Each structure stands twice: as structure tokens, then as C-alpha cells.
Design a protein around this ligand. Structure first.
Ligand SMILES: Cc1cc2nc3c(=O)[nH]c(=O)nc-3n(C[C@H](O)[C@H](O)[C@H](O)COP(=O)(O)OP(=O)(O)OC[C@H]3O[C@@H](n4cnc5c(N)ncnc54)[C@H](O)[C@@H]3O)c2cc1C
Ligand SMILES: C[C@]12CCC(=O)C=C1CC[C@@H]1[C@@H]2CC[C@]2(C)C(=O)CC[C@@H]12
Length: 521
């Protein structure tokens, strides 16, 4: 993978083109880094491997954990840079304290620079922080790009990757404005283009970095069945995602879950940039870690992100509850993996009744029709729990017992076994009703359903070791000159934690910004 400049010269090759800043990828991080470089007058090229910008960032809800900024001040939030620092220190400990500090301390500058652009505006949207710890916001402190009329961004609207409910069925944007990740990437692209210093390319693939005397000076890029050599005078920012789509790297690293279960765009994030970085001496960390979530198994073997659980319960292959089904998706996923004994917890079984007329009582992204799950056998239905356990192969006495015990907890209003519905996260998706506890509803109105739940992800979070300025470090702690990484190309400062909504995009955006500031020196 690693190409030596002297070797290229020897073969008779030279630079196709030159820029100051070369950005690989086009999620929130990449485009934030692109904008930061180009807005202060550095010639910038962005390389997107696929025909659509945005990757998983486009799929996202575009909730962003950038605390203590002018956006939260407009909402009057009771929060601060120091309050957010306390929450991270309480969850993560002293491991990566310097990167924790740079994350919360730089959020305000990133947000102010971006909002100065007429294509970008954010607003606070309530979504709770995920753990009980000092500095938690029960309402959350995360911000979101405003809905975007695609007419405002010209030809860029047709180049944004569409939402999951359209993108895995050969479809483009559904009716209405661009929202969530579509609005984030549409606005960032329009900002990057407005600088007049950036080129935005699709179907341009990083293959290898180019090194001269141990310094990264550019990269080899495929585009139009041809090879190009792009020089980067100040540096290369690699924000091209993780290993989530590469089954071989995940099996080698011991990453739980599976490439086919990842909610990454199929084929996009195959660890190309992590590989390219290792090839020039970059150290790696946390490769067995990912941003986990439970997934509803699909007829085609893929998964759907299961979030905002509103009802049902979940059993292992023994027909027993083992977790709080309302847990934030990353803690849910880690509890599946911790409980899994040669396959008792992957798959798990979501059990629910006809309270939502056949629907599974959660948000599934994307949302496959019950009838297609039932025809494929991913879901099974029956008139009794007895017959449901027979069709699923679950122990019938244990499932019946599990459901009667859960139903007693819903009648009483407290789940003494797993404490479901006693957290602001659990309550956020459960509108207070006539029940003693809105997160606990009895499973008793037939027909009954079991859906197979697997260990999905929203990307992996392991990869190249970086400093507080996004510089890729070798095993000895020294910087690889000219090379930066951010987002899921870099090992997350968050370790084994998913602190709150928007940490993936927030960390990606801050370290892409800091990498561009470092290149501008
Ligand atoms: C339904 C859903 C909702 C989510 N909601 C949120 C949320 O609210 N908040 C949040 O913070 N996170 C959210 N996430 C997760 C979030 O989208 C990701 O964790 C994060 O955006 C990953 O960013 P990245 O830069 O690492 O990867 P990506 O955003 O995937 O960027 C990688 C890009 O680089 C391209 N690329 C890859 N290899 C190459 C190469 N060799 N050359 C050129 N280009 C290449 C890819 O095609 C892709 O376009 C959500 C995820 C899902 C599935
Ligand atoms: C849970 C989540 C993902 C990961 C992340 O980090 C931040 C959030 C909060 C916003 C959620 C989003 C998932 C998709 C959601 C449910 C929508 O369709 C509307 C709001 C949005």
C-alpha cells in the first residue's frame, strides 16, 4: 500500500495535481475539515469513494455532541464546557484526558466558524445523555442542522446519500426537505463549495499514501478507471470511516457483530484509510470496539437499527429476560455480547403483541413491513405464547413464565429484575399513559410475535492513534508528518463508552477542524 516518491519518479510517474489539503471521505468530519481548510484560503480537494457524499453521516439523525457553544446559549441551556468535561471524566476516566479536554474546549470555535457560513445553522434538540453520571443532561445538550430545502444547494442536492429507508431499496430522497444527516451533509457541501477553494469529487478512491523521507506528501487515487497522484503541500486528512464493512478486518480484530449487520452504506467503509495509515507506520487501538446497537434481522441477512423501544420484552435462547430493553442502544448491544454463550444472546428474540397492530414497538431504520419479516421467517407470529415458543424453538414454560412476570411488573409499574423505565432515556420514548409505568406495557393482546435481534453497529470506533490535533502517531508516540485522521478512521477518545447522542459526529467534527487548523500553521 505505502508508495515511495523516489519509486514513483523511477517508474516515470509524476503528480497529476496539487492541493494544500487533501481530504479522504465526505462525512460530517471530512467536510468540516474541508471547510476549515478552504475557508481560510487553503486549496482543498475532497475524495468521496462512492457516487454519493455523506456516508453514514448522511444516514444519521445529525444529532451532534458539541456542548457549551453559542447554539445552546440561544436555547438558554443550563450547561457549560466544564459541566460536559465533568460528564466525560466521570464516564471515561483519565484515559485520553487530553483529547477529552480538546473535544469540549474546541466545540465552541467549530460551531461559531460553521454558523458564520450562510449555508449552516444549528439548533438544540432534546435527546438525553445515555449514562447516570455527574454532568449528565437528562434533556441532552446536542445540536442539529436545520431542515434544508434542496433547492438552496443547487446540483449538490442530487449528490447527497439518501436515508436508509430509500438507500437500501435503490431509491433517492423521499418527499419533503432534507433532514438529519441529509441536511448536515447538504449544508456542509454548500459551505465547502462557497469558499471557492475546494473541489468536491465523487467516485474518487484513496488506494495508497505517498511518502517521501517518512513524510506523507500526497496519495494515489482511482477515478475513471485511471490512477492519479495528488500532492498535499500541508497534509492529508483521512476521515473515511472505519472497518465496519470489512468482515476480514473485523474477524481479525475480534470485533463483535458482523459486516452484513452494520448500518454503514454497503461497500463504503472497508477500512481503506486505516490500512493506508498502518502501511506508513500508524499505530492502531480499540479495533475490537464499535458503536453498537441491536438490529432487527432482515429477510436478506442484513439488520435495521432498533431505537426508541416503546414496548415488548427481549429473551435469550432460554426464553428469559437478561437486560433492560430500554437501555441506550450501545449499552443494549454490549449486554447482548456479554450474555452471548456460543449463541444464547445473538440472536435474541423481541416478544410483542398486537398493541401496534402487528408493528414492532420501536423505531426500525430501515422499516421492513411485518408481512415480509413473517414470510421470510425473521419474525414469527401465533395465537398463543405456547405456539409462539414452538415456532421459535424457545422453551415454552420459561417464555410463558417470563411474559407473566413481565406483565405483573407492568401492572405494578416497577420491573424489579432490570429496572426498566427508571431512567430519563427509557422515559423519553414512552409518553406517560394510564399505566403505572409508560415503559412497561403488558404483552397480552394476541397475536404474539417474536423477531430475531442481532448485534448491529453504526460504524466501528477503532483505528489510527491520533493526538489532540488529529495527527497519526507511530507505536513510539511520534507524529507521521502530513497525515491526520478523524471520525471512525481514528480510535475514539470514547473507549468502550457511547456517552450521549452525537458523540460520533461531534468528535469527528472537532478533530477534523483541529487537523485543518494544524495544517494551516
Ligand atoms: C440510523 C443512524 C442514525 C445515526 N444518528 C447519529 C446521530 O444522531 N449522531 C451521531 O453522532 N451519529 C449518528 N450515527 C452514526 C454516525 O453516522 C457515524 O458514527 C459517523 O458519522 C461516522 O463518520 P465517519 O466519518 O467515521 O464515516 P462516514 O460518515 O461513513 O464517512 C466515510 C466516507 O468516506 C468514504 N470512503 C471510504 N473509504 C474511502 C476511500 N478509500 N477513498 C475515498 N472515500 C472513501 C465512504 O464512502 C463515506 O462516504 C447514526 C447512524 C445511523 C445508522
Ligand atoms: C439516536 C440517534 C442515533 C445516534 C446518535 O448519536 C444520536 C441520535 C439522536 C437522534 C436520533 C438518532 C437516530 C435516528 C433518529 C431516531 C431519528 O430518526 C430522529 C432522531 C434521531
Amino acid at each position: 500500500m505505502g508508495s515511495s516518491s523516489h519509486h514513483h519518479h523511477h517508474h516515470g510517474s509524476d503528480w497529476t495535481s496539487e492541493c494544500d489539503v487533501l481530504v479522504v471521505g465526505s462525512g460530517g468530519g471530512a467536510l468540516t475539515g474541508a471547510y476549515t481548510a478552504a475557508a481560510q484560503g487553503l486549496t482543498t480537494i475532497v475524495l468521496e469513494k462512492t457516487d454519493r457524499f455523506g456516508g453514514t453521516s448522511a444516514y444519521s439523525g445529525a444529532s451532534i455532541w458539541l456542548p457549551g457553544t453559542q447554539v445552546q446559549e440561544r436555547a438558554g441551556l443550563p450547561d457549560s464546557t466544564e459541566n460536559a468535561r465533568t460528564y466525560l471524566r466521570a464516564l471515561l476516566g483519565d484515559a485520553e484526558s487530553e483529547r477529552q479536554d480538546a473535544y469540549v474546549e474546541t466545540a465552541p470555535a467549530v460551531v461559531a466558524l460553521l454558523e458564520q457560513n450562510p449555508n449552516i445553522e444549528f439548533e438544540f434538540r432534546a435527546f438525553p445523555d445515555y449514562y447516570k453520571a455527574e454532568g449528565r443532561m437528562d434533556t441532552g445538550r446536542s445540536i442539529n442542522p436545520l431542515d434544508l430545502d434542496p433547492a438552496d444547494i443547487g446540483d449538490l442536492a442530487g449528490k447527497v446519500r439518501p436515508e436508509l429507508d430509500q438507500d437500501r431499496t435503490g431509491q433517492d430522497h423521499a418527499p419533503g426537505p432534507m433532514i438529519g444527516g441529509r441536511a448536515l451533509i447538504g449544508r456542509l457541501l454548500a459551505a465547502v463549495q462557497s469558499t471557492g477553494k475546494a473541489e468536491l469529487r465523487t467516485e474518487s478512491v484513496l488506494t495508497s499514501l505517498i511518502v517521501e523521507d517518512g513524510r506523507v506528501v500526497g496519495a494515489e487515487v482511482e477515478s475513471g478507471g485511471e490512477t492519479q497522484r495528488i500532492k498535499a503541500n500541508r497534509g492529508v486528512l483521512m476521515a473515511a470511516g472505519g472497518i465496519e464493512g470489512n468482515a476480514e478486518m473485523r474477524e481479525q480484530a475480534g470485533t463483535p457483530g458482523k459486516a452484513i449487520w452494520s448500518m454503514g452504506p454497503f461497500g463504503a467503509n472497508t477500512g481503506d484509510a486505516i490500512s493506508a495509515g498502518i502501511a506508513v507506520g500508524g499505530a492502531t487501538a480499540l479495533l475490537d470496539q464499535a458503536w453498537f446497537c441491536p438490529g432487527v434481522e432482515q429477510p436478506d441477512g442484513s439488520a435495521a437499527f432498533m431505537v426508541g423501544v416503546r414496548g415488548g420484552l427481549v429473551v435469550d435462547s432460554a426464553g428469559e429476560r437478561y437486560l433492560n430493553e430500554s437501555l441506550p442502544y450501545d449499552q443494549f448491544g454490549r449486554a447482548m455480547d456479554a450474555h452471548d454463550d456460543n449463541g444464547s444472546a445473538v440472536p435474541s428474540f423481541m416478544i410483542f403483541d398486537s398493541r401496534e397492530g402487528g408493528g414492532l414497538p420501536a423505531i426500525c431504520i430501515p422499516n421492513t413491513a411485518p408481512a415480509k419479516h413473517l414470510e421470510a421467517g425473521t419474525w414469527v407470529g401465533a395465537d398463543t405464547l405456547e405456539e409462539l415458543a414452538a415456532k421459535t424453538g424457545l422453551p415454552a414454560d420459561a417464555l410463558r413464565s417470563t411474559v407473566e412476570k413481565f406483565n405483573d411488573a407492568a401492572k405494578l409499574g416497577v420491573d424489579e429484575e432490570f429496572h426498566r423505565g427508571e431512567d430519563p432515556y427509557d422515559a423519553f420514548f414512552c409518553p406517560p399513559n394510564g399505566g403505572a409505568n409508560a415503559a412497561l406495557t403488558a404483552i397480552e393482546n394476541g397475536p404474539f410475535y417474536a423477531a430475531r435481534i442481532v448485534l448491529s453497529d453504526l460504524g466501528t470506533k477503532g483505528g489510527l492513534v491520533t493526538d489532540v490535533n488529529g495527527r497519526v502517531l507511530r507505536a513510539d508516540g511520534s507524529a507521521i508528518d502530513g497525515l491526520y485522521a478523524a471520525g471512525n478512521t481514528s480510535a475514539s477518545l470514547s473507549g468502550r463508552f457511547y456517552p450521549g447522542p452525537g458523540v460520533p459526529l461531534g468528535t469527528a467534527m472537532v478533530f477534523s477542524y483541529r487537523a485543518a487548523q494544524d495544517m494551516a500553521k
